[PDB]
UniProtKB/Swiss-Prot annotation:
Regions annotated as coiled coil: none
Family affiliation: Belongs to the universal ribosomal protein uS11 family.
Name of this protein: Small ribosomal subunit protein uS11
UniProt cross-references to Pfam families, sorted A to Z: Ribosomal_S11
Length: 128
RNA sequence: GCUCGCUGGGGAUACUGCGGGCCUUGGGACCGGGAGAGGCCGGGGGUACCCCCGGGGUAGGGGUGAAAUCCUAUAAUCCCGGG
């Protein structure tokens, strides 16, 4: 059908957001923009605003190179770390929609352990 | 009356003790269909995490209330194929 589709991996955490566009197989990188290379202050990196700014740029290269459709794979750190995606996920998805890209299947691929390793912080956790 | 008692004899067998006899209620033994993360031994798996190699890809990654240390151009973070 000679139509260009790809996959947008959205690493969302409580400190940073990374948007990475690759081909259908994921073996070739088309664009990769993080939340830290679009804003200066460290506090703004996890902000939903920085996420959408990064997504706009990341989508620009995809449009230029010919990608028209994208399947979104949002993921939190997972494993022994936090599982809930950070705030900069819905913002990134909406920014990708707004930039003029068709959005296909949306799935969460956070790595869930089947009672794997020991989380950091000891038995008493963080005593902030 | 007291010396908290000792001793010579006679009488009773309700209770305790002792010897004997007969019972199943307590507790054990055994058969029947089932329940259970009860133990030990052998075989087979689950994702996740860490390291290494091969491909893509550039400049940040990580972390905090905010930062810094730390990793990163000897190609980091991230995605993919393998051990």
């Amino acid at each position: 059908k000679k139509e260009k589709w790809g996959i947008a991996h959205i690493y969302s955490s409580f400190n940073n957001t990374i948007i990475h566009i690759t081909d259908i197989t994921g073996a070739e990188t088309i664009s990769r923009w993080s939340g830290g290379m679009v804003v200066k202050a460290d506090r703004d990196e996890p902000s939903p605003y920085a996420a959408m700014l990064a997504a706009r740029r990341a989508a620009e290269e995809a449009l230029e190179k010919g990608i028209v459709g994208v399947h979104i794979r949002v993921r939190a750190p997972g494993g022994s770390k936090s599982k809930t995606p950070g705030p900069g996920a819905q913002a990134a998805i909406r920014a990708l929609a707004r930039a003029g890209l068709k959005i296909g299947r949306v799935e969460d691929v956070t790595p869930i352990p089947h009672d794997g390793t020991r989380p950091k912080g000891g038995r008493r956790g963080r005593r902030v």
